[PDB]
Amino acid sequence: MASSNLIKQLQERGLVAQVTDEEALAERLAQGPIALVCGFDPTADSLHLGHLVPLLCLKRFQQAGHKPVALVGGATGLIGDPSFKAAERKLNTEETVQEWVDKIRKQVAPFLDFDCGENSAIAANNYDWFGNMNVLTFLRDIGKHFSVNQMINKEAVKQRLNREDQGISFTEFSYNLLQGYDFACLNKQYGVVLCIGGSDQWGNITSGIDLTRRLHQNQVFGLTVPLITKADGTKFGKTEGGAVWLDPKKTSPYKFYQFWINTADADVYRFLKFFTFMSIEEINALEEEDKNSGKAPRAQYVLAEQVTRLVHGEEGLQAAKR
Amino acid sequence: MASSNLIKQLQERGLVAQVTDEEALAERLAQGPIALVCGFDPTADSLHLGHLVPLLCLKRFQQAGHKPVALVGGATGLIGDPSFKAAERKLNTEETVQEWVDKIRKQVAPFLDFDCGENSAIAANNYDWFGNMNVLTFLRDIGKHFSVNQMINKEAVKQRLNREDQGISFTEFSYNLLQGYDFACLNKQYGVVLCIGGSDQWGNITSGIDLTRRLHQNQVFGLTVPLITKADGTKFGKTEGGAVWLDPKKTSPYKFYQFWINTADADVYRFLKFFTFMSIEEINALEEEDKNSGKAPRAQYVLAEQVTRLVHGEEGLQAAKR
Ligand SMILES: N[C@@H](Cc1ccc(O)c(I)c1)C(=O)O
Numbered sequence: 190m191a192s193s194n195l196i197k198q199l200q201e202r203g204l205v206a207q208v209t210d211e212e213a214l215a216e217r218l219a220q221g222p223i224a225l226v227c228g229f230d231p232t233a234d235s236l237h238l239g240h241l242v243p244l245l246c247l248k249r250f251q252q253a254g255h256k257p258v259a260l261v262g263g264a265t266g267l268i269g270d271p272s273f274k275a276a277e278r279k280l281n282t283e284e285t286v287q288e289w290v291d292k293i294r295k296q297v298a299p300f301l302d303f304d305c306g307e308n309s310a311i312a313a314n315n316y317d318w319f320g321n322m323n324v325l326t327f328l329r330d331i332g333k334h335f336s337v338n339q340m341i342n343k344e345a346v347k348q349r350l351n352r353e354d355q356g357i358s359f360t361e362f363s364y365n366l367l368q369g370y371d372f373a374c375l376n377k378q379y380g381v382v383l384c385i386g387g388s389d390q391w392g393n394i395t396s397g398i399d400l401t402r403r404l405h406q407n408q409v410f411g412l413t414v415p416l417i418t419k420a421d422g423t424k425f426g427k428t429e430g431g432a433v434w435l436d437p438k439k440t441s442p443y444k445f446y447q448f449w450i451n452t453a454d455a456d457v458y459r460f461l462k463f464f465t466f467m468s469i470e471e472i473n474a475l476e477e478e479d480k481n482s483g484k485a486p487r488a489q490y491v492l493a494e495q496v497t498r499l500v501h502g503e504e505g506l507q508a509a510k511r
Numbered sequence: 512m513a514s515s516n517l518i519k520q521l522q523e524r525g526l527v528a529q530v531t532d533e534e535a536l537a538e539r540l541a542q543g544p545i546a547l548v549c550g551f552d553p554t555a556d557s558l559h560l561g562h563l564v565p566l567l568c569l570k571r572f573q574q575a576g577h578k579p580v581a582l583v584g585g586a587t588g589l590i591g592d593p594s595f596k597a598a599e600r601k602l603n604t605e606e607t608v609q610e611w612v613d614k615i616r617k618q619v620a621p622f623l624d625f626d627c628g629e630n631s632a633i634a635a636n637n638y639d640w641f642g643n644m645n646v647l648t649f650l651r652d653i654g655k656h657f658s659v660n661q662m663i664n665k666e667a668v669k670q671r672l673n674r675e676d677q678g679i680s681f682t683e684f685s686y687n688l689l690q691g692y693d694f695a696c697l698n699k700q701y702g703v704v705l706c707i708g709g710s711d712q713w714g715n716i717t718s719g720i721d722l723t724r725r726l727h728q729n730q731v732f733g734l735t736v737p738l739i740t741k742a743d744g745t746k747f748g749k750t751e752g753g754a755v756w757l758d759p760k761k762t763s764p765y766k767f768y769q770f771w772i773n774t775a776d777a778d779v780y781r782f783l784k785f786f787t788f789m790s791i792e793e794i795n796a797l798e799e800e801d802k803n804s805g806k807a808p809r810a811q812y813v814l815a816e817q818v819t820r821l822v823h824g825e826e827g828l829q830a831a832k833r
């Protein structure tokens with residue numbers, strides 16, 4: 190019964206919002222390297238800061254020796270995840286999502302190692318299995334395992350069903366089945382036994398754990414990272430100018446760097462934990478140092494340098510100074 | 512603004528449970544012959560008495576000069592209609608339903624005229640369009656027009672969502688979309704503007720009217736026939752021996768004939784109206800005659816003869832006496 194401390198280490202960073210059976214997950218992680226998955230839906234031709242914590246978290250797992258599967262939702266992006274959203278998401282055309290899928294895949298790759306040991310990353314696209322799946326097969330083979338009674342009290346969509354000013358299409362109501370089947374499929378072909386996701390993904394993830402159990406009798410796990418918040422209560426990664434994109438052509442490395450310099454003192458130390466690979470020891474020493482220096486805090490500059498390098502590499506960091 | 516009296520004539524027989532915009536439907540019917548549809552799901556290799564009133568009602572429309580489309584649910588029978596049902600219907604295999612589809616089509620044909628004028632009958636199978644429809648197309652192109660909030664308060668499934676001892680799979684919850692799209696598709700290819708169905712079909716039918724409106728901007732109509740009841744409160748067409756089948760190999764014409772002879776005095780005159788083509792005038796005179804004869808009622812014998820001939824022809828009637 191060895192027990193892995195990886196979940197504890199992430200908890201210490203404040204990076205675990207919810208986790209299924211943390212005791213059993215920690216024991217499984219100590220048994221050896223696992224394949225895990227984190228996914229992103231092509232809702233734009235680029236990811237932005239709201240996708241960064243989960244993405245880096247997938248990298249933290251790889252660095253701990255596990256194998257990351259980076260899934261891009263070629264099919265789920267044609268449907269739209271309603272989870273904790275107030276209104277129906279825009280339906281994009283198949284041609285546009287396909288192009289966005291490619292853009293996101295290429296943008297995600299540099300963050301993971303695709304050529305190292307047995308823990309090399311794997312790129313996945315759920316369009317591989319839903320793209321040509323026929324409706325009767327879906328409704329019967331996947332659909333019979335879902336109780337609508339359970340689906341409607343899922344927290345993620347409850348509000349869309351209870352408030353009047355907030356309905357939900359059958360299209361988005363079905364999304365939970367698609368993402369639940371993705372977990373079963375990834376477990377079947379790649380041995381994925383852990384799914385990590387954003388704060389709003391609990392219900393989608395647990396539907397995947399249950400369906401994996403139902404379809405393959407394998408126990409799998411899920412973990413969500415927290416909704417990143419600012420002490421002043423405003424929305425993180427949201428500016429007058431819109432989202433802060435990970436694509437240098439949409440948001441320049443210079444502007445990306447400026448966004449991090451602009452971090453509030455109240456948020457900066459927490460943000461070093463969520464967005465960088467500096468040890469907890471070093472971040473605490475840095476906080477203590479700023480507390481006693483009588484100088485401007487060095488933390489914003491450190492945060493800006495670290496995340497800008499992570500996202501745009503040494504070249505982006507240099508472009509941030511010209 | 513001519514007005515057709517066909518709906519009135521059916522009302523007089525006690526054959527109209529609910530009808531959408533009866534005034535506009537009656538005017539449309541007076542404009543000229545229409546294409547209408549009644550459908551049957553392959554839940555067995557034969558229809559039984561519970562399907563007879565709607566089937567004969569399709570024939571009453573044809574006799575009034577309209578064109579009947581007899582739809583057999585090659586795809587909907589792979590899903591299962593939950594309407595006013597207490598529990599999940601059994602999922603049958605594709606091979607078995609396909610064989611049942613053929614059996615039902617052939618059994619329905621003799622009841623309609625496929626070779627007369629411009630009002631010759633048309634056989635349809637929704638497997639033609641759902642059989643190969645891909646899931647993303649279904650969820651997006653059909654699914655975006657359905658509000659889950661509306662779907663859950665449909666009377667037909669409300670009980671499955673409210674009672675605890677009664678859940679519903681996403682599989683059966685989706686059925687309403689399939690039958691709603693069938694109406695739009697039949698309106699598009701055959702000009703069908705009226706759907707008739709059993710008593711439990713109101714919600715499926717209205718979903719079809721709404722989706723036809725949404726997809727093609729055409730106003731179409733629906734009508735349901737009543738749940739046939741017996742004065743003693745027991746279930747019509749249900750015996751110790753099970754259902755009363757329309758297939759002579761499952762329920763012999765002799766036994767079929769005996770079932771009608773066994774009709775209660777309290778039900779027989781109503782049953783002559785629902786199950787035969789005798790005029791209302793003649794049925795009333797027959798009731799008056801039995802009231803004053805001092806003889807056994809002739810009505811059961813007349814009912815037995817008429818329905819047995821309708822269902823098994825002159826040959827079945829003769830076999831009923833040997
Ligand atoms: N619904 C997720 C994106 C996503 C989609 C499919 C999938 O299998 C997985 I793992 C993740 C989100 O919106 O973050």
Ligand SMILES: N[C@@H](Cc1ccc(O)c(I)c1)C(=O)O
Pocket residue numbers: 548549550551552582584587592637689690693694706708709712715
């Ligand atoms: N749900 C119906 C059968 C049926 C199925 C599909 C369809 O388009 C039509 I019109 C009728 C019943 O159970 O009676």
